[PDB]
Write an enzyme that holds these catalytic residues in place. Sequence first.
Site, PDB file in Angstrom:
ATOM      1  N   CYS A   9      -3.035  -7.744   6.226  1.00  0.00           N
ATOM      2  CA  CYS A   9      -3.204  -8.411   4.936  1.00  0.00           C
ATOM      3  C   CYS A   9      -3.576  -9.883   5.075  1.00  0.00           C
ATOM      4  CB  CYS A   9      -1.919  -8.297   4.115  1.00  0.00           C
ATOM      5  SG  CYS A   9      -1.362  -6.601   3.858  1.00  0.00           S
ATOM      6  N   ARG A  52       3.823  -3.159   6.950  1.00  0.00           N
ATOM      7  CA  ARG A  52       2.854  -4.023   6.293  1.00  0.00           C
ATOM      8  C   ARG A  52       3.530  -5.321   5.900  1.00  0.00           C
ATOM      9  NH1 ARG A  52       2.058  -5.330   1.002  1.00  0.00           N
ATOM     10  NH2 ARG A  52      -0.046  -5.507   0.103  1.00  0.00           N
TER      11      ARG A  52
END
Length: 347
Positions: A9, A52
């Site tokens: 990300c 994540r």
Amino acid sequence: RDTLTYSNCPVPNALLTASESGFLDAAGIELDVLSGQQGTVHFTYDQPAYTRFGGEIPPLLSEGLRAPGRTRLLGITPLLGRQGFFVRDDSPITAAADLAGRRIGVSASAIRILRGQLGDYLELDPWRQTLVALGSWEARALLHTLEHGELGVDDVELVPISSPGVDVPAEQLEESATVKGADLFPDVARGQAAVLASGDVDALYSWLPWAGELQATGARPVVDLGLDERNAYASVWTVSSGLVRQRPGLVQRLVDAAVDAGLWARDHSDAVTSLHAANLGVSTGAVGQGFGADFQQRLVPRLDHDALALLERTQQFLLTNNLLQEPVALDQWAAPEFLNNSLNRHR
């Protein structure tokens, strides 16, 4: 090597830092970047060994609406940098009040939130609900911006456009099994500059290092939201719940690596800027602008009350705008033992 599926990300974080600097490998762990472009038809958070570290909206919707309990929260890292509705340098717009009657390019998702018309939201499928909720970045930024000119949503013209991460899902802007992030992320700023240059709309929302590159083309934010923490977000580090239950030793090694990378980052600021820049395909200056001054000093993951309050503020915005029905129980979502044990090594 223990292998974990992963999503890279565009937020400053210790997991990427640990992976890129060698801490993860030293901990016997490696990341396998997921390729979840359209056609995958599978919710990433449902993978058995997925981790994540990124924007909190998708995980909040997964935990609060779609499938509670699928993930555990390992830590939080704030996000705040260059942010706002950008206009051409020579645009006649110089103050928030000047936005009256102007064309504000925003995602269809943002328009639904801004007009309070979610229509088919609750009965909408998970991934599309998420895409709608991602319109929150533009929506909150616009509301805050308009306050400076004592203007309301009805005082501007909302024009549907494609916004990065919203209309073009992260699954198409992040590193994949065959595509590097540097070959997808940079294009965004070039695209935003092209949109503003065309004069088809007067302003559009930009943030993250994209904003850094965009401002380099001459564009400027009507109101720089990066100077007020009410525009900050809480990046969240999640991991599959099954991993915490069955392999706590692996999760501990994972968190230790990130914590150690975060401590290391304090003494290697430039290196940290570069690894984030290289993965985004942007300049080091753009990274500094998009992620903030000395962000390299604040990468050790957090679960303190101020960090949780920031995350709470984001979900409260989702709740206030009916993007969530009930709040996620943040404390239970968190698996605080890992970060605590990790920090205790240095105490």
